[PDB]
Write a protein that binds this ligand. Structure first.
Ligand SMILES: COc1cc(OO)ccc1O
Ligand SMILES: [Fe+3]
Length: 849
């Protein structure tokens, strides 16, 4: 018949593996672009090492399964190739194919090498009038005897759940079945089995009672999204907890390798909590560095001279992989930190009222503020009088040197806003304040001034059960002052609000509303939508490395004695408190327009550009994100209506339906009966659902994760812990504010040790890897043969490229100063593209850090 020409592109384990790639990190992509040939070790793949077998998409055998044509082995290396690129090795392989064998549509691969490799692609240079077929793989191929079923890959062509090619139908449903792989057994590194399980692996019951943590999800007290199932043996002292392991399983392929050493961020983070944390505390349990800061100047010295420690420790936390890049130093005993953008221009601006309020709109947590409708603000808590009652905010003390409006008119004109942190911490406060932490539940009323700037009017510091629990809310309301002890008091007052905000942001805005919430969709997508499905291809890029970064969090971030419990206010009740907040989480309210309206920050107004009128126009996060959200909406809508002819073609889609059902009923199973879930019946419901998922994985996480060090790298500006209560007016504490307010501020906020852990961790989190795939229409190569989709994708990147310039001119507009503030820090967090490193910009396609 003939002999089809195929070219296989792969990558060897050495190239992507951290343990062996800890040599290159200064520059990647270059180095003669490993054409494969030079330093030939590739002969190893030749011979009886790897075999491929074509599956016909047009010719079906006895039953109806496509005809397979002779296992062919790799023959020879292709030295160069126009589009080879770094770390890749090409191989030639011709297949025995007759004219009457049909068109290939999938292939099987066997790896007899005893050392996995990353298969990249396969291209076929056909026979009849049919063009070149491309197979995009990007998957690790492990030894052939470990599988029992044999790895299968499908060509470029995207087909609806019809599973289209008849000879290909049973191959499509079979692999999907392989992806679910039942729900029994312990998962191994080489497996690609996606399944759910509850959060029952965060504590360590065997090591103690002090170490057990409540089971998150599967119950009504602490509901939570499901997480990827790992099959470890249960804890001994507890059948419902999973035993800890220094290695958490995630389906192979969800774990992304890198070419550069400095890009294994999860590796850096694991090392900080395993090598750096333990080594760091010994120097404090010693005396090389005092346990506390004594002045602000001593804090500013962290990014200048750094912190001197015994060279014995430095020669240990310096030569190690990935950190050898992150950590700054001079030589012997001097761990420095890069200066955060917050003080690069002015070192004092963070203390200004205008900066404190501006950060509620353009900061690390710009998602909470809400337009105040009634007065005084009331709680949403139960019958414990203060929720039934309200807030004790002084209506007698609102609006000093500003507007001569009443509280009734200010609300009518929509000039009053609220940053409510009262309810979430309240029920755990008596418990939190029993430890070494002393916190308050807070509230802060802000006023919109004529110049467009926001200004905090009053802060209410509330405590629990003043002689009770019922009819309880020991509140105190503090007002702004610019001098005398009253100003040192006010400064401390803001630190109480911020300690609440930083913790709410870390656990909710960030971990919960992003990392936690997105994982069940990833499991749902892989278990039910075939790689070939159009929706699968729309979703995939936004899932990259999410399960891997989350697996690390469960292991050392949000675990029993992790960094989060040790650095944030909510302490050991950190994660469980976020499950209590999950209670109020509603999918549809995650869309930017809905969220804004929900918080009263925007009203529906058809005349306006995005269909909504903003209550505060100088609102960076909102103004910018609305542009990106709309870009996402248009792209998903164009993409969806390209494959779905009518609403009935959607309802007929078995893969899409089984996917959503399992997502609602299992993935976010604690909310299966929620009335707000979209029904996958209309095409506009699928557009909305997909837009929310993408928004969450890209722009929401970006706006939330990337300003962490730039704003919070200065612990004074974003303290994460409160150690003291507000100084008693006549006590020796009050006299200390008068004497040394700086040291008074330092004893109230996060201690020195925890500050070094926080800076280390949020420094890694806020950095962009060099091989980051950005929202800016970035994908990888030929993900689909559908020319129409490719074009709709280019249009997407094009509107993003235009949005970028658009955001750039706003930062140069001096009338919009909530974008810069006294700190002179232009809001660049929502710009799509970035270079690498601590760049206060860049929107990755997915939650990768
Ligand atoms: C537990 O949640 C977290 C997830 C993170 O991933 O970016 C980082 C810090 C966290 O506290
Ligand atoms: Fe993150």
């Amino acid at each position: 018949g003939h002999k089809i020409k195929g070219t296989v592109v792969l990558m060897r384990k050495n190239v992507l593996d951290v343990n062996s790639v800890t040599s290159v990190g200064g520059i990647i992509g270059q180095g003669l672009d490993l054409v494969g040939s030079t330093l030939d070790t590739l002969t190893a793949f030749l011979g009886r090492s790897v075999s491929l077998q074509l599956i016909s998409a047009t010719k079906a055998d006895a039953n109806g399964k496509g005809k397979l044509g002779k296992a062919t082995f790799l023959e020879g290396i292709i030295t160069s190739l126009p589009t080879l690129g770094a770390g890749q090795s090409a191989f030639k392989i011709n297949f025995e194919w007759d004219d009457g064998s049909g068109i290939p549509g999938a292939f099987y691969i066997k790896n007899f090498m005893q050392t996995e490799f990353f298969l990249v692609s396969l291209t076929l240079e056909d026979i009849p009038n049919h063009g070149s077929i491309h197979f995009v793989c990007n998957s690790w191929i492990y030894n052939a005897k470990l599988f029992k079923s044999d790895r299968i890959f499908f060509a470029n062509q995207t087909y609806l759940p019809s599973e289209t090619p008849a000879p290909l139908v049973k191959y499509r449903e079979e692999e999907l079945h392989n992806l679910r792989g039942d729900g029994t057994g312990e998962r191994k590194e080489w497996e690609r089995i996606y399944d759910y399980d509850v959060y029952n692996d965060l504590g360590d019951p065997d090591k103690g009672e002090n170490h057990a943590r409540p089971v998150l999800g599967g119950n009504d007290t602490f509901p939570y999204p499901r997480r990827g199932r790992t099959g470890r043996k249960p804890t001994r002292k507890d059948p419902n907890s999973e035993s800890r392991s220094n290695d958490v399983y995630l389906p192979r392929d969800e774990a992304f390798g890198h070419l550069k050493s400095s890009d294994f961020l999860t590796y850096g983070l694991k090392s900080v909590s395993q090598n750096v944390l333990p080594l760091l505390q010994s120097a404090f349990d010693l005396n090389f560095t005092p346990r506390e800061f004594d002045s602000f100047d001593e804090v500013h010295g962290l990014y200048s001279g750094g912190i001197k420690l015994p060279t014995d420790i430095i020669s240990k936390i310096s030569p190690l992989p990935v950190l050898k890049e992150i950590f700054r130093t001079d030589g012997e005993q001097a761990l420095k930190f890069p200066p955060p953008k917050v003080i690069q221009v002015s070192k004092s601006a963070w203390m200004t009222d205008e900066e404190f309020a501006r950060e509620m709109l353009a900061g690390v947590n710009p998602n909470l503020i809400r337009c105040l409708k009634d007065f005084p603000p009331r709680s949403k808590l139960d019958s414990q009088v203060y929720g039934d009652h309200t807030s004790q905010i002084t209506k007698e003390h609102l609006e000093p040197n500003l507007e001569g409006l009443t509280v009734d008119e200010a609300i009518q004109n929509k000039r009053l806003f609220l940053l409510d942190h009262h309810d979430p911490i309240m029920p755990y406060l008596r418990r939190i304040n029993a430890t070494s932490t002393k916190a308050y539940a807070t509230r802060t009323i802000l006023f919109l001034k004529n110049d467009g700037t926001l200004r905090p009017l009053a802060i209410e510091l509330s405590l629990p059960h003043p002689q009770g629990d019922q009819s309880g809310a020991f509140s105190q309301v503090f007002l702004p002052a610019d001098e005398g002890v009253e100003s040192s008091i006010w400064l401390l007052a803001k630190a109480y609000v911020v300690v609440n905000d930083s913790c709410y942001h870390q656990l909710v805005s960030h971990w919960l509303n992003t990392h936690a919430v997105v994982e069940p969709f990833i499991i749902a997508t892989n278990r039910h939508l075939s790689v070939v499905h159009p929706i699968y291809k729309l979703l995939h890029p936004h899932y990259r490395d999410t399960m891997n970064i989350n697996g690390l969090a469960r292991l050392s971030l949000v675990n029993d004695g992790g960094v989060i419990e040790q650095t944030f206010l909510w302490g050991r009740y950190s994660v469980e408190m976020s499950a209590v907040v999950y209670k109020d989480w509603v999918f549809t309210d995650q869309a930017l327009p809905a969220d804004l309206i929900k918080r009263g920050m925007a009203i529906e107004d058809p005349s306006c550009p995005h269909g909504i009128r903003l209550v505060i126009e100088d609102y960076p996060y909102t103004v910018d994100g609305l542009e990106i959200w709309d870009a996402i909406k248009t792209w998903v809508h164009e993409y969806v209506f390209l494959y779905y002819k009518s609403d009935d073609t959607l309802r007929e889609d078995p893969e899409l339906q089984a996917c959503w059902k399992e997502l609602v009923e299992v993935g976010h199973g604690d909310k299966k009966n929620e009335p707000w879930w979209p029904k996958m019946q209309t095409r506009e419901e699928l557009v909305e659902a997909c837009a929310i998922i993408i928004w969450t994985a890209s722009a929401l996480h970006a706006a939330v994760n990337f300003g962490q060090y730039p704003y919070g790298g200065l612990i004074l500006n974003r303290p994460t812990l409160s150690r003291r209560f507000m100084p008693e007016k006549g006590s020796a504490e009050y006299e200390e504010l008068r004497k040394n307010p700086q040291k008074a501020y330092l004893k109230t906020i996060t201690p020195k040790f925890q500050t070094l852990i926080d800076l280390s961790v949020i420094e890694i989190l806020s950095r962009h890897a060099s091989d980051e795939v950005y929202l800016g229409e970035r994908d990888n190569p030929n993900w689909t043969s559908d020319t129409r989709a490719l074009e709709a994708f280019k249009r997407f990147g094009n509107k993003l490229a235009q949005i970028e310039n658009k955001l750039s001119e706003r930062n140069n507009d001096e009338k919009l100063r909530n974008r810069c503030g006294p700190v002179q820090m232009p809001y660049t967090l929502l710009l799509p593209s970035s270079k690498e490193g601590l760049t206060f910009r860049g929107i990755p396609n997915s939650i990768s850090i």
